[PDB]
Amino acid sequence: LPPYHTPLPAETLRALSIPAPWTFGLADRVRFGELDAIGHVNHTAYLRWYESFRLPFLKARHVTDYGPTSPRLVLKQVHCTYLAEMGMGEDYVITGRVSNFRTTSFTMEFACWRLGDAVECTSEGSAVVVLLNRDGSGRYPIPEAGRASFVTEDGVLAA
Amino acid sequence: LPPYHTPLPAETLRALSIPAPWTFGLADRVRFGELDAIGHVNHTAYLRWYESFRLPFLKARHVTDYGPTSPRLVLKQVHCTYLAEMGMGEDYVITGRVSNFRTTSFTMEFACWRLGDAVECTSEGSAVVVLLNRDGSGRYPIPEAGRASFVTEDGVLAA
Amino acid sequence: LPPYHTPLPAETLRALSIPAPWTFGLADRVRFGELDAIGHVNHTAYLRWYESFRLPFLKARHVTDYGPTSPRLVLKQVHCTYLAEMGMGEDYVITGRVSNFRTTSFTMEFACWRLGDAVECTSEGSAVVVLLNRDGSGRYPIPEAGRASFVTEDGVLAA
Amino acid sequence: LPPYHTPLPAETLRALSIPAPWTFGLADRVRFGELDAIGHVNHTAYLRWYESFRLPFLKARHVTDYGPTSPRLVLKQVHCTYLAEMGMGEDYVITGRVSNFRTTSFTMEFACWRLGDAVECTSEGSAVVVLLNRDGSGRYPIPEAGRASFVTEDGVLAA
What we know:
Four copies of one chain form a homotetramer.
Chain A: H1 10-15, E1 25-29, H2 43-60, E2 72-82, E3 91-101, E4 105-115, E5 119-132, H3 144-153
Antiparallel strand pairs in A: 1-3, 2-5, 3-4, 4-5
């Protein structure tokens, strides 16, 4: 088992049988409160896990520092698929990347890997995020160091 | 069935077989997302219902209008009891009242009444709330109209 | 304002300026607990609203009675778009339909209509749902009365 | 920082400056989804943390192994106090102990310790739990090993 709440690099992921293109994971465990009326992880927990991943990822990628001159990040769309049902206390790793970016918005892809006796993808997801100016003047361009990290870490070509 | 999300006065409560001392009720219905892994409303949903109740109630009692000037409401303590399990789709009424008050703080009591062939109290609870000046500078006295409404409407004797 | 938690037919929807193809709505109000750290309805609340809609809709459409010989309904995928941000206490109507069906699965589309000074669509959504046999023997065909309701109420051609 | 989601014994607690009487801790980190509309951990998240804690704790104390045979755990009451606000990403340790017990029921006490430059108790709480036979037929006596563990590990004098 890896440490929880700790960025996992590609090396650690491969050791856990989590394949490319994933380079950044975070591990957590299922909580009782995420279980629905028949004892499965509810469909929105997965989306919450992906949203939790985004916060530190987007700081590590130099998109935002969440401070006063940072862009406000706004979700435009999400999608989530449910490949295998999960239950109480299961350990998992969330992987997320940037798959595509534009001037003032970008797309991420996500997966949830259960660490059982087998490593198994239980869910995939995506999100489209827009950057807005906190002063209401409109869209805010992704910082240049963010564009650079997306290229050098996520391997997204700028073209 | 009374209307939902609408203050229900004492006479409406008595018609629903909800007794004294309750004079202010709000009706809603159990959601699927509130159910725990065995099909019962989870223990925190009750406390959320009591919280929801407090917002319109404290405006009705003249404590706050929730404007930019108004006091900050700070929760210091809650208790909740679980008298009967509730499942999917049950209608209920939340009742609440102020039971004590001093200068800048007060205690409320709550109950949950399941509507149905017979009306049944499924839970009781309490909260202690304090009032602070929004600008950080001190404690905020319960408005005079609040103190009076607590005495006349909630039947509290004095402080 | 319409009544809450009460199926709204096409007539009522049109009166609220909610256009075709919508024929079935349910009204509710935003709760404090659905608000995220900056005071907007969080992205998963919308998905919970759509899931809440499904439960009674699928019974009204004769897909399931949620009993022992009913299919188990399993979500395969969802998508949600966020068109306008929402805040505390806003009244809304959720509309949902079946847009397409197959033998053992179907697709629904959803929208959230805010009832403010203007009626405004704040979000759209979709879901793909599969029917499984509660005894584990695999997929379960959508009942014939369900197929019929989809055609006659949602206006989905079986072709 | 200790490991997360792992029972932390008394010696680990003292090294984190968490005092007697606590001997059993579990660490986690605040999530974005736990934050209320002003950026603070919402009052119910604490109670959820205490609940999460109880599950491994009651297995460690020999009350239940959560098998098909094991007792049903029923919550009758909780209290929670709010001593200091918590924001995004704070690490914490939950401590819990049994404080009293009788024949088929017991009372637990809990605290939340924010980890940081200095360790600070942000909340205290309590729960009353009863044990029922899973087959519906009666009340379930606290196993003898449970009673003994409560006396020796949690320092309870008798019943």
